[PDB]
Amino acid sequence: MDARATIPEHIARTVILPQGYADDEVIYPAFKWLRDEQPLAMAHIEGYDPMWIATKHADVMQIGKQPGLFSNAEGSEILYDQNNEAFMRSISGGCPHVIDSLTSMDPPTHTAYRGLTLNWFQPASIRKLEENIRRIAQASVQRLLDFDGECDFMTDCALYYPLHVVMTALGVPEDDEPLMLKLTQDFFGVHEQSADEAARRFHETIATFYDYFNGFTVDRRSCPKDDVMSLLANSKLDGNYIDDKYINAYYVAIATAGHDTTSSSSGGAIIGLSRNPEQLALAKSDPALIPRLVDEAVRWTAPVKSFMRTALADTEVRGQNIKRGDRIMLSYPSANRDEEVFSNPDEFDITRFPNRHLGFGWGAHMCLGQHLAKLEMKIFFEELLPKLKSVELSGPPRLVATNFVGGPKNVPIRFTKA
Ligand code: HEM
Numbered sequence: 001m002d003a004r005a006t007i008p009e010h011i012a013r014t015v016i017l018p019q020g021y022a023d024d025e026v027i028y029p030a031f032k033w034l035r036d037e038q039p040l041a042m043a044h045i046e047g048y049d050p051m052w053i054a055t056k057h058a059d060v061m062q063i064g065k066q067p068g069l070f071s072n073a074e075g076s077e078i079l080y081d082q083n084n085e086a087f088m089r090s091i092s093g094g095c096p097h098v099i100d101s102l103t104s105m106d107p108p109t110h111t112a113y114r115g116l117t118l119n120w121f122q123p124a125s126i127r128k129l130e131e132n133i134r135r136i137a138q139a140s141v142q143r144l145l146d147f148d149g150e151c152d153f154m155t156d157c158a159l160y161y162p163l164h165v166v167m168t169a170l171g172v173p174e175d176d177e178p179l180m181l182k183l184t185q186d187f188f189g190v191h192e193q194s195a196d197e198a199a200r201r202f203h204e205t206i207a208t209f210y211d212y213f214n215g216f217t218v219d220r221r222s223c224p225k226d227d228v229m230s231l232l233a234n235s236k237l238d239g240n241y242i243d244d245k246y247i248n249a250y251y252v253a254i255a256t257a258g259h260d261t262t263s264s265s266s267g268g269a270i271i272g273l274s275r276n277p278e279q280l281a282l283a284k285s286d287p288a289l290i291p292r293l294v295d296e297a298v299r300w301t302a303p304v305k306s307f308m309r310t311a312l313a314d315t316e317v318r319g320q321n322i323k324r325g326d327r328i329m330l331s332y333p334s335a336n337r338d339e340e341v342f343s344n345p346d347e348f349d350i351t352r353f354p355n356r357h358l359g360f361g362w363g364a365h366m367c368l369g370q371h372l373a374k375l376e377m378k379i380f381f382e383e384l385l386p387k388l389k390s391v392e393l394s395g396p397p398r399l400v401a402t403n404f405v406g407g408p409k410n411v412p413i414r415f416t417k418a
């Protein structure tokens with residue numbers, strides 16, 4: 001048990017473990033204490049590696065923008081306990097990355113693979129999806145309106161539109177919805193068999209998904225389209241096609257990254273608006289505010305609770321001596337309530353501007369999908385809000401108990417139709 005750990009065990013447990021993330025009033029006060037008293041310090045709790053907890057907005061940016069010093073590739077970029085990490089390595093040829101996605105990479109590899117789609121995901125390219133996104137948003141709004149004034153905003157509505165959007169961006173047909181839900185909800189969901197058994201199911205299931213995706217790769221090499229599958233399928237590096245393992249990991253990364261985060265942030269927006277009806281009234285009388293509503297939903301929800309980095313050299317941050325090999329947890333939620341940046345950060349306020357939140361991260365790995373996420377949420381709220389006279393919560397929201405991709409999973413609401 002590492003001599004440098006100074007974070008009290010009860011605080012360290014609260015910020016590291018998955019369970020506390022199910023309650024805002026458990027997690028945020030723990031980060032507040034850290035920001036006030038031990039803004040960048042080391043924690044070591046049973047079953048986890050020792051790790052620095054980056055709680056300050058400044059620090060999360062400084063770390064995120066220096067991938068040559070603070071690595072995604074060297075350790076697990078995801079916060080696993082040791083048993084889970086060991087399992088992951090045992091099914092991944094010793095690597096602490098289950099697939100070859102962008103978040104598993106460091107420059108220059110990372111730069112090359114990110115660069116394959118970087119232009120596609122810029123605003124002017126994404127803007128062309130507007131009409132498709134708007135049709136998809138209207139269908140989800142219609143799903144909600146088919147209820148007689150009562151539903152679960154997540155499971156009856158917000159679960160769907162962001163998956164359809166990622167599907168449209170990839171090129172996956174609408175009829176493959178069941179398969180895509182299995183992908184993001186079952187196979188890569190959080191689950192709140194011996195070891196050899198779970199390993200067998202994993203290898204068999206990922207092969208099934210990769211075989212499915214390969215069919216698209218092949219198809220798009222003969223019949224190109226303006227989708228991401230086609231872009232990746234027809235991409236070359238050093239005069240050759242990209243290996244299937246990178247292509248298929250890219251498809252998976254796009255679907256998994258872009259589904260829950262967007263859905264959860266949408267749920268957060270609904271929670272904010274239900275607790276602050278004056279803001280619903282404002283977004284409805286001034287639709288030009290919706291982009292600020294969207295950014296506030298992402299700040300306040302912060303569905304991505306963490307990513308990890310490993311220090312590749314001895315170095316200094318906020319006066320602390322970070323040593324080669326030390327792991328660091330980046331807390332986007334804590335950065336997003338940093339009092340040095342935001343006033344009254346616990347308040348949901350759609351007028352907040354500027355809104356320099358880290359819900360999409362910062363630096364070399366900053367969310368590839370951010371522009372698509374902002375566009376689709378904007379369009380969704382543009383279509384939903386005129387249709388609602390009022391919305392309120394009918395009971396407590398249920399948040400995912402995870403230290404990774406969390407936020408609202410169930411948001412029971414009542415509403416009146418406009
Ligand atoms: C509100 C919705 C979303 C949130 C909060 C979110 C958040 C994040 C965050 C925090 C990261 C890590 C950034 C870092 O290390 O600095 C990330 C990476 C990524 N996100 Fe998003 N995301 C969202 C929507 C999407 C969408 C719609 C896509 C669709 C393509 C997407 C694709 C990605 C990819 C591919 C990466 C890895 C990029 C890399 O490693 O270079 N995300 N996202």
Ligand SMILES: CC1=CC[C@@H](C(C)(C)O)CC1
Pocket residue numbers: 098184185188189190256257260404405
């Ligand atoms: C490896 C993996 C971890 C998280 C998954 C989730 C829950 C975000 O879909 C996506 C992919």
Ligand SMILES: CC1=CC[C@@H](C(C)(C)O)CC1
Pocket residue numbers: 101102103104252253254256257261304405
């Ligand atoms: C937000 C996000 C969740 C999953 C990551 C992974 C593990 C697919 O690279 C990509 C980015």
